[PDB]
Symmetry: D2
């Protein structure tokens, strides 16, 4: 119903409510304070952060998990620019995030004198949608279109610039009912049958999972197709969480990082490769496509063809629908060829070798393997796990097959540090009854640790682990390998236990290997935020780096 | 199509174009892009030199519009590219698939003290990229066609650095393939089937995509089964006409007395097909008190006045075909609906009776009637922008051409002639007729040389008023005085003959029809200048929104 | 100039233009920008309707180039603006001050489903802004002129939303004022005075700014006092000529045998005045083993091959005047220097002797000699881009015109005619001569109507080869075959007459001179078509870098 | 003197030394680590920060006080985007700051697939000068021009994007002598 709104801010908040938004992350400022004020009169919870970048990170987690866009709210100028890295990361990983940023008044003389920054131009390179509202009456539609652009197709981030006068002034208009997802049909039946027939013909078929395959709305369909077909599966990191070793016996590991993955050998062996929700950007096709197999592309969008990615059959449409139909045209489960069976057998052996459940590993500082094992003991199907960027990331990725977590946020193409804690707080807000474990190094921790105050204020049940080496190890090992000397990668030590407790959170510092498990256990059992510092000995990283592509 | 070692990037480009089915390229050579022109010499692809780059984009658009596959423009760096901009923005607005390949300085000189063409084309294209990685040459070009041809078709630009097209490269040609998209979900279709059965005043609003040849059969099948009233935007102007559907309600978006608008305002159910708000402001017809259904190849580009209740995204032809099978009875018009269609019938009779117009200069109606006589079902009619455009639109219901190119959101002048040459090349055995004002004519008349050189069977008509009338009448209405809309006279007969084309200048009313027939009878290019008396324009303008 | 309450923003704009001294505006009206055209009706400012927007920018550039004050183009939204782009990029490259005012949709529709013209003009302009604050209307316009006219002159674009120019506004007209910048520091000047006294092979390299009329007297005073050799880029082509300075060494940047390059390579001291690397690649002449001195209105735009040792920034005329007073003796040329100038003298004698060329089609040299005869010291000569351009440049030393417009970094075709019409309007009592090829001609020939309508005393010459020769010879050299550079013939005589202009077509060698004289004698527009035999081009191209 | 440099990074550092730079603030990453490495062989002190934004802030202070541009050094992607607010603030207050940011290799296929962010476009709205080196031989001039644009006229911030292959690969060229301020 077209109503008369005293403020555009009230219409904005009503639209957000129509979108199903449960909370908003951000920092208020003069230009955007009317939206924060209007938020007081709604069901939406205002979550003040300590740095805008983290508002975007928290929003992305909400988006990845619920599939519905997380929302960040910031003021003009630095308020907006402090979000950029956050928006780039969300867009990069395909997480739906909608950011509402304040701006000077439309007629502001500083506008023409360029006293104010062209935020739309700045955000354009790192978003799917970036626009400024210049017409008060287009307020509801623009916000609504920001959500659609962010959640539909290949998810991403959307930025909306709100001139101060527009949100403060009165407007005429009605709330646009969130239609959500359009009713898109599965691929054509003829197309599907053609693929079912290829499947019934293939001796060495395999599924390669990409971003869209890990989306929640495709979870049931994917499960059903794998159970019916029993065809091997490998996943890019943007789908790292869609399937794991413990839920599918024919899982071949994630591809894109290590040079000895069963997934890579099976793809090379395949006579039929079926990609689901995959995009060449998730993993260089040159690395796996040998052109010897028939290539099927299934996604909500046609393929971005290229030298090593020219599908023979393209099934564009509702992924869930297409997968369900395909599953109904599969007569029996695949009988692995002896070659494929050997490859899976080899992955089994390599996992046996990587395992160290029986090793003492009591050195101090701790061996990455000991920490990884300790982490595996506290993360279970009821726990979410967020991973930052650094050398510890490579170690965890190597053992993803051993983490039985409810879900894991690790994918990070931009390799942005500081994402773990904010990701965990966001993941916690989605399911406050569950526990969340975040892990980072000292580098990334200090970039977003200001949010520890946000965590205590919310009594967020998050346990953050810090691998302590007193430097930027991931960069140090790359310099050492190329130049055999270090530069700008070493810094001083800190008392992280005292650091954490200064926020009011529970802090711990592991002083010996023997103390690791007991400490993590005591930290996990704490009702509220907890931080555990773990001194690490990265001396063996080369042994691990030698397994990289 | 295996991976090969190409002597020049230019050779791979040409091969990729052949793979896309390109039959000709429009453009003007330059130092930076010359190797591609040279490479085309060993191709079956025909090189067609134009006289002004803008026209290469116009001709390409017509090719893309008719064939469904991108027309191709090839230009050089700097001014070669900047001259394409308007033609590209026009293609993008009308949804005509066009791929423009533009030359550029060597990659190493880009930063040296080199226009940032990509930044200049982004605002007016769906896809704008510069090849900075030689090994992705075929990739970028191939994806340029995908971007231009798929979803809502549009224009695509690809900047080719000189060193990249001149130097050796490795790569393979990528095969061309509209992916397999299926009809909208059967459940959704059933849902819409229900709404229809429950509607007493249903109506179809056709958009651009509804006019695509891939949906022609399904559309007809849907309309013939339900006999539900239909109205169209100008981008979907040719989807349906008065002759093949008695319940056609006209084109909406220009006149304030259309049966289509009256039916939309009366509707309790509006089903839009291949429609986008940009085609006709929803605020103009959507009262908001009618169930809105959206059917298209893409989700709805929602607006404050366009928030569908049911969105069906997928293959249009498939969707409509299923919908047709879910309709059991032909609609029984309501009293109000019936009245509205009856009015349009009486309205047409009136517009027709409006009768011995032998004045000179010629009365617009006289020119329209004569135009309709020479334009037959085998002829393509292209229409430029100006006052004559309104007169022609007013009578589209009586024009029976193979096809009409008139939709022009940007209102760009000079489109007619190049569109016609482009359209003629797609079907060189047919005749094409383009019409414009004297202002639009001089903006692209240099292509008459191209037409003569090609022996294009195009007849160009010029409504001569010696000014920019469409602007003048607006100035008159608002200011009661004119400024910058009047210019001198010309002898278009000699003008056209100078090109080696047949020229004619109507010097009296009775000479009109005979002149057109003689010009139409010419096997090759011909131009007819027609002096027009725009005195009655104010009476037509009153029928406008 | 007090603060006032204007009925329409358009009225304030017109007042601001008058304040800038604008005498005329070039352009084409449209709905969005019509109120400004209407407002100009009550102004002393003359409205000059063109036939294609690109030409409004070209004509404006000529106006700005000659008067030192920005020429003005006024166009409407969308295609009106996109059609200006190439003309704007051309102005910006040659340093011609131009201000373009473009219409735009109402501010509220900008985001609605409106080209982002500012983003499209930024790459090719010094200043590009959109007025989003009605109270800053005069501000933005005024600052547009400052940006265009000051420092290194260039083009400026200002987008005017329709509601802003149509709605009432408050504000005052801002008075126009080149600020008071003083000569370079007296210490710096003395430093350079020393270097000169110590140099045995000094030479001046003149750039764009050195050709500005404000520096003409000082320059002459400096050269006459030191008699130090001089060479110029094409942007500074008219600063000095062979007649007024016996130690002139020619124009550098095109031919590989210039005395200027030989002197630069020999120099132990090079003093650049109003020069910028973009005018002539420093890598081409700077060996790096000579003291480099930079004098200009702006700091040096340093490059790997242009890192001055002494940078003098400030008022050029003042700086040069002081430098002249710090020179005590006229330079005594060195043996090598003397030889080099002697060679150019013998070189010119040779280029001259090269003699009964009565072939038909006409030999380029025959056409050049004839052109030099009709071009006198009171005539302005505008030159388009093409092969004829090279021939003319080769003999610039024997052309004695009031002024020559030839510099064209973008190498944009079609500039000649509009430049001439623009130049003629600045001094309507003088004659203007423009020359182009058949390709360049058809890109802007629509302005012949504008010329006839204005009674412009312009003579346009066309070198007719029936193709794009400049491109063809490059294709020949590299591929030994042609592609896309050949088109059909035309009857330019009838073509020109159709506009109401006097047309001539040279049908034999002996007819050339008589034809030009008759065309020159016409008081109004005239066009002469001249068939040319480009067979010897390969022999001229060999003299190119 | 035109020399043969094993790495563009070495020429960059030599140019910085010619500019009088005493220290550099930043955080290293794969794309830009060769410049940090080359900094070890110079008189310039490497100052590692904990967040890039602060590298820009520290640089601005150096610039405001000495009048000569402060220098920040960051890696590609988030390394660059984390600087934006810092660059906007320096440019806003008229503080001379020169930021050198890494980038994927020029021919990186991710370039066209837009996998990497157009940093030049992002920094343009908040800087006086923003440019990417696409020609190894224009390395010294571009850095030199960044300082000139930052320190001269109304001071501000300048951004230079350095593709990984350009700083890692060999180059030919000489250090452009810092002329500093023209004699106006
Ligand atoms: C410095 C750094 C990383 C952090 C490494 O340190 P810790 O977080 O302490 O991990 P560890 O490797 O020492 O355990 S990742 C890393 C990455 C290697 O490129 N991600 C970055 N993110 C931002 C926002 N700026 C710069 C970089 C460059 N790289
Ligand atoms: C001047 C003009 C048109 C032309 C009118 O003249 P004729 O073509 O002679 O038609 P008529 O109306 O006189 O019959 S349309 C029109 C349009 C009204 O906006 N399209 C334009 N296209 C370009 C490329 N630049 C400016 C305009 C503004 N408008
Ligand atoms: C085609 C062409 C020129 C014209 C040559 O022909 P004529 O003007 O007939 O001269 P002539 O050489 O045949 O005598 S210049 C030239 C130039 C060599 O780059 N300038 C152009 N200007 C535009 C607006 N588009 C493309 C080019 C590429 N080049
Ligand atoms: Mg660390
Ligand atoms: Mg007209
Ligand atoms: Mg020619």
């Amino acid at each position: 119903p077209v109503r008369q709104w005293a403020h555009g801010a009230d219409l904005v908040v009503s639209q957000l409510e129509a979108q199903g938004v449960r909370q908003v992350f951000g920092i208020p400022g003069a230009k955007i304070d009317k939206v924060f004020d209007s938020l007081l009169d709604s069901s939406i919870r205002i979550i003040p952060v300590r740095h805008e970048a983290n508002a975007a990170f928290m929003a992305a987690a909400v988006g990845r998990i619920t599939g519905k866009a997380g929302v960040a709210l910031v003021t003009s100028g630095p308020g907006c620019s402090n979000l950029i890295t956050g928006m780039a990361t969300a867009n990069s990983e395909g997480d739906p995030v909608v950011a509402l940023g304040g701006a000077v008044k439309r007629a502001d003389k500083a506008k023409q004198v360029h006293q104010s920054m062209d935020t739309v131009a700045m955000f354009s390179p790192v978003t799917k949608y970036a626009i400024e509202v210049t017409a008060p009456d287009a307020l509801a539609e623009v916000v609504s279109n920001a959500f659609r652009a962010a959640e539909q197709g290949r998810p991403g981030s959307a930025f909306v610039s709100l001139p101060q006068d527009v949100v403060d002034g009165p407007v005429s208009g009605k709330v646009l009912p969130a239609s959500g997802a359009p009713q898109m049909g599965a691929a054509p039946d003829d197309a599907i049958d053609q693929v079912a027939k290829l499947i019934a013909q293939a001796k060495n078929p395999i599924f390669l999972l990409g971003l869209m395959a890990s989306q929640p709305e495709n979870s049931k369909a994917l499960r059903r197709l794998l159970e019916t077909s029993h065809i091997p599966v490998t996943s890019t990191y943007q789908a790292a969480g869609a399937v794991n070793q413990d839920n599918f016996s024919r899982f071949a590991g994630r591809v894109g990082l290590f040079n000895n993955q069963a997934g890579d050998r099976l793809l090379q062996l395949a006579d039929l490769v079926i990609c689901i929700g995959y995009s060449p950007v998730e993993y260089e096709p040159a690395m796996w496509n040998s052109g010897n197999a028939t290539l099927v592309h299934i996604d909500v969008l046609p393929a971005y063809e290229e030298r090593n990615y020219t599908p023979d059959v393209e099934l564009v449409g509702d992924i869930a629908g297409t997968l369900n139909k395909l599953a109904q045209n599969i007569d029996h489960r695949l009988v692995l060829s002896p070659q494929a069976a050997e490859i899976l057998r080899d992955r089994q052996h390599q996992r046996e070798l990587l395992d160290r459940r029986g090793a003492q590993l009591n050195q101090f500082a701790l061996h990455p393997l000991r920490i990884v094992r300790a982490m595996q003991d506290i993360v279970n199907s009821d726990v979410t796990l967020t991973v930052d960027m650094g050398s510890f990331h490579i170690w965890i990725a190597r053992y993803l097959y051993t983490f039985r977590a409810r879900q894991v946020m690790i994918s990070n193409g931009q390799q942005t540090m500081g994402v773990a804690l904010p990701w965990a707080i966001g993941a916690w807000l989605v399911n406050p009854e569950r526990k969340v474990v975040s892990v980072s190094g000292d580098g990334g921790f200090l970039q977003s640790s200001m949010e520890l105050e946000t965590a205590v204020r919310l009594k967020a049940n998050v346990l953050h682990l810090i691998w302590v080496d007193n430097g930027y190890n991931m960069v140090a090992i790359q310099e050492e390998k190329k130049y055999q000397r270090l530069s700008g990668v070493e810094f001083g030590p800190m008392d992280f236990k005292a650091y954490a407790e200064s926020f009011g959170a529970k802090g711990f510092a592991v002083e010996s290997a023997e103390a690791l498990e007991p400490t993590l256990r005591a930290a996990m059992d704490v009702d509220g935020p907890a931080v555990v510092a773990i001194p690490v000995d990265y001396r063996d990283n080369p042994l691990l780096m030698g397994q990289l592509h």
